[PDB]
Design a protein around this ligand. Structure first.
Ligand SMILES: Nc1ncnc2c1ncn2[C@@H]1O[C@H](COP(=O)(O)OP(=O)(O)O)[C@@H](O)[C@H]1O
Ligand SMILES: Nc1ncnc2c1ncn2[C@@H]1O[C@H](COP(=O)(O)OP(=O)(O)O)[C@@H](O)[C@H]1O
Lengths: 213, 213
């Protein structure tokens, strides 16, 4: 059974603002999610300095992007620290985020939407290209859980009994908007990645599917 | 909870014979599994002639090969008819297979191991390159289940609560032997596929993972 939680009011406002904005540089969402992925990998690496066993659940440290055309889904995965059930509820919704209102006010003043990451709310930039998202996470400290949101005022968290097992890490499963399907294309994904992410310490793997000739 | 079943005696013998054989043309396993995949796709397509709704669980008809290096696993997937729990138990183990003893006798006489498919036991050719296998299947008529074998005399069947959801079809998850890791390599997989499978009516998709430069 899934559990439902209410988003902190300002986060709901931010999501409404982002999913509805006609901003032109929507591709910035990838830079933000890749940055969050890198941060998660930094955390597990750092924790492992004094607790090496933490790495054993998934020795490979990577960022992986997997387009799923049929389902019109784009997945951004990392083998970082991951999030326990409590962290998913805490970090992605119920607790007030310092930069939320600040960013919205900056936006009103004319600030570029690309500043979202500097305000600490880059995760929500995903709503620039997706109308729904499932965050699948496995922290060494908990079971695998699924957090899901459609930019509405509430989200759900469910023990994961339906997705592939993640050794450790997080998968941002984006259900792309009908007019943003270009982010399923290899060429497009490649140019966006090369553009705003040259100094990422981890390999960024793109999963490509080709018909054998 | 998993359930354990005993293999029909002759199948156990066949598996022992195959996993231990020093045969040189081990690559034939791919041709056999791709053939079984094509057959499964033929079945759902045919059934759909009088029951079109059967296709809706997964409209795309394909064969997909996905190497998973870290886990030393190679997956062969199809969106065919799939197998219900009863079919997995029935079709892959507990029931006597007509060609089992016949093939073993042919083998003793000098027959090429590649004849395995003509005897109707091509599925077991997978033990030429793997010491363990999980068959994940989803038939429109049942839930998703996992059948698992290590070539021993018994196998297990478990309701699937750990793998990605298959719309419909089957995944042969092969845990490759340490000296057969060449089948994780794109170039190698490509040449084997092009060699013994030119007349397959369905697209054969290879999932490749590359680091973004
Ligand atoms: N890939 C991830 N792995 C682990 N935690 C994440 C991931 N993405 C987001 N989070 C968590 O949820 C929070 C919300 O994301 P975000 O608004 O972008 O925060 P921040 O700007 O501090 O990265 C993060 O602070 C982080 O704790
Ligand atoms: N990919 C698959 N999809 C559905 N059923 C399969 C698949 N692979 C094997 N089977 C089933 O298990 C049986 C055992 O496989 P195999 O020995 O190769 O049989 P056959 O030679 O008749 O294909 C098959 O007859 C078939 O019913």
């Amino acid at each position: 059974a899934s559990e439902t939680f209410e988003f902190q009011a300002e986060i709901t406002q931010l999501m409404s603002l982002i999913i509805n904005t006609v901003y032109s540089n929507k591709e910035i969402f990838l830079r933000e999610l890749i940055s969050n992925a890198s941060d998660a990998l930094d955390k597990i690496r750092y924790k492992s300095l004094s607790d090496p066993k933490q790495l054993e659940t998934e020795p490979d440290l990577f960022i992986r992007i997997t387009p799923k055309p049929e389902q019109k889904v784009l997945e951004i995965r990392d083998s970082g620290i991951g999030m326990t059930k409590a962290e998913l509820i805490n970090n992605l919704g119920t607790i007030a985020k310092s930069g939320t209102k600040a960013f919205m006010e900056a936006l009103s003043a004319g600030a570029d939407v690309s500043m979202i990451g500097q305000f600490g709310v880059g995760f929500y930039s995903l709503f620039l290209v997706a109308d729904r998202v499932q965050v699948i996470s496995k922290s060494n400290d908990d079971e695998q859980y699924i957090w899901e949101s459609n930019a509405g005022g509430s989200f759900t968290v469910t023990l994961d009994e339906v997705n592939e097992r993640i050794g450790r890490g997080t998968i941002l499963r984006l259900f792309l908007k009908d007019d943003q399907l270009e982010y399923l294309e290899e060429k497009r994904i490649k140019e966006v990645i090369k553009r705003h992410s040259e100094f990422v310490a981890y390999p960024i793997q793109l999963v490509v599917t080709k018909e054998v000739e």
